[PDB]
């Protein structure tokens, strides 16, 4: 019945985690920055600088 | 595998090449030939100046002039907009 | 509203122009390029630029008349070799105060 | 906008350069190789990608233009012997103060 999914009788709270890592190459380093080459602007709205 | 086709990227850019032959030809022929042979399209080579003139018949300046014409009349937004989607 | 830089003044009502407050006669083409010049004071001007914007896109004459041009403006205002309104080789030209 | 690095420092609209405090005068396409250093900060440069992007397609000289020219970047601005701009072997160089 509809009652469990309303009530969150039977519902699971679930988290993934995302590993990623920036390493030295023979072509520099990679740097976790902001400078994101062509993108937009409303993908941009929530990542802090 | 790296290496392999994408097999989407393909169909892009054949579409892509379909979009500047005709944004070519809606230009002027000679100022298509021009950039064409300047960037190397239908060649495996791009050419300098010289190369154009020899085979157009005139100097190197107006090259340079007929090149100006061409990416004056390219920033048209009716182009600008056609072509820029595609990226 | 007058367009004022260092000591170069201009009245885009009646298009007289005053340098370091003596009036001197310029032509209409050089009073265009002028008129640019000092409306992108800070930001070197380069040929195609010139052509494209201040004269006609039917222009086909050489590119030494703009250099001629160039030269009329120096011998109107500034005479000095060294002067206000620089070169760049192969960016064309740039009107500031020297450093 | 002025863009800078340890004690050289760039403008975008005169082209010109300032090396601790002290204005400089430098060749067009040498300004572009220092341009292409300071827009890839701490990122090594090499000779082949450097002369993919500065430098036209159609470039068919030799390898010793762009050693020369970093030549010339040394004896303007880095005269010391040890240098900012360090070069990697078979891997080109690099703008960097030295640790």
Do not use: C
Request: net charge negative; no cysteine.
């Amino acid at each position: 019945s509809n009652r469990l999914v309303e009530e969150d009788v039977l519902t699971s709270i679930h988290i993934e985690e995302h590993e990623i890592d920036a390493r030295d190459t023979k072509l520099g380093a990679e740097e976790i920055t902001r400078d994101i080459p062509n993108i937009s602007d409303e993908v941009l709205a929530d990542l802090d600088e | 595998d790296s290496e392999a086709v994408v097999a989407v990227d393909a169909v892009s850019f054949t579409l892509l090449q379909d979009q500047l032959q005709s944004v070519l030809d809606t230009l002027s022929e000679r100022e298509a030939g021009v950039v064409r042979l300047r960037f190397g399209l239908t060649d495996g080579q791009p050419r300098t100046l010289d190369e154009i003139g020899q085979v157009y018949g005139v100097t190197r300046e107006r090259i340079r002039q007929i090149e100006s014409k061409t990416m004056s009349k390219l920033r048209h937004p009716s182009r600008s907009q056609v072509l820029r989607d595609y990226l | 509203v007058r367009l004022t830089f260092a000591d170069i003044e201009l009245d885009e009502e009646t298009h007289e122009v005053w340098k370091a407050g003596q009036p001197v006669s310029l032509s209409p083409t050089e009073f265009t390029l002028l008129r640019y010049f000092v409306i992108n004071a800070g930001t070197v001007l380069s040929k195609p630029k010139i052509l494209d914007h201040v004269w006609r896109y039917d222009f086909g004459g050489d590119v030494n008349v703009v250099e001629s041009y160039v030269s009329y403006l120096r011998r109107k205002i500034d005479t000095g070799e060294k002067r206000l309104l620089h070169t760049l080789r192969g960016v064309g030209y740039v009107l500031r105060e020297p450093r």
